[PDB]
């Protein structure tokens, strides 16, 4: 559920993304696809939760006479009951859905890192800080090909094989 390592204050163009470091320099670059899906989903969720709470026409209070006391306590009970029900619903939905929003975001992290895992199996080495070191040279074009999900494993398979075996 909870999938966190650390945050990037320098990536200012999206919820999720990449930090690339090659011989052409380093930089932050947001993944617009997963960030976009997340914004769509969260917007629809928020709008659904809010817009379901619609309003009727009920001047709330009533004031009854001295021969309508039990009538009056019933009406105050109804007011307070609708109060408590709507308060209860709002509180619990906010709690639950904040939990679920954070968990959804964690799973988005996990899915992005899985995608980069899949494009790059043995051509790179995974690190416990949730990163990859290429066994080959990944230039800007290679980086972009990984970012838009079009990396070419056989393209660098031989170079990565050579360097990977070279480590040992």
């Amino acid at each position, epitope marked *: 559920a909870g999938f966190i390592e650390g945050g990037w204050t*320098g990536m*200012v*163009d999206g919820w999720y993304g990449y930090h690339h470091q090659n011989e052409q320099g*380093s*930089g*932050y*670059a947001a993944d617009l696809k997963s960030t*976009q899906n997340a*914004i769509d989903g969260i*917007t629809n969720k928020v709008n659904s939760v809010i817009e379901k709470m619609n309003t009727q026409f009920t001047a709330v209070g009533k004031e009854f006479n001295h021969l309508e006391k039990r009538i009056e306590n019933l009406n105050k009970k109804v007011d307070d009951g609708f109060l408590d029900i709507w308060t209860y619903n709002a509180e619990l939905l906010v709690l639950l859905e904040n939990e679920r929003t954070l968990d959804y975001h964690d799973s988005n992290v996990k899915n992005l890192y899985e995608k980069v895992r899949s494009q790059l199996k043995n051509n790179a080495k995974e690190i416990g800080n949730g990163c990859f070191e290429f066994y080959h040279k990944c230039d800007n074009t290679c980086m972009e090909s990984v970012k838009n999900g079009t990396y070419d494993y056989p393209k660098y398979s031989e170079e990565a094989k050579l360097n990977r075996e070279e480590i040992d």
Partner: antibody
Amino acid sequence: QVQLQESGPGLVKPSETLSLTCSVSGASISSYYWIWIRQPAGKGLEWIGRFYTSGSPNYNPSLRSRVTMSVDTSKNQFSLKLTSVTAADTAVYYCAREEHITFGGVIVRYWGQGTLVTVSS
Amino acid sequence: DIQMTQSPATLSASVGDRVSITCRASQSISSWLAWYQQKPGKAPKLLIYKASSLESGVPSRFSGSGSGSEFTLTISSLQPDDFAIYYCQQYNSYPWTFGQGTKVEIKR
């Protein structure tokens, strides 16, 4: 409030490298992407491109190599450089700041003055 | 990438009249359209983001309705100051492209 002023020559000869400088007051360049915008005559706007200090630039696929965007964190400016300007490259230029993430995606609230670049001998 | 049809190119409408500008797209934009009021010879002013989000300081007469490929900007009561050229921007993907713009005049 952040202010963006624009400096351009006014005339660029038809086979020269246009150099434009947007000066930034009230903000640090190293913290924002910076955007260039273009308007030929009174027809439609066109997003030129985006650049960031510790990030990766992206420009219009229409204008890729000709365009190089650079940043002076010293002078608090960012410059746009266009190789081999043309008559079609005659237009108004605007520089804008790319804001950070909001719930409505990335916004461009802050806009430059607009400077005319004329490509004439 | 994404070509922009902004109809109609030129309008003239009396004061108080509702005005509707349609912005159709090449592919799917979800709700990632922006709307700018470029007054004559000035910088464009962002009217609406996220398609259905009014920016702070904008009169509530401006409303934005649409998702996917079709969108409409609607001015509830057209006022004198609302004479300008109105563009619809796309930030769903790069390159960000604008519409040709709609020229809003006022019949008097």
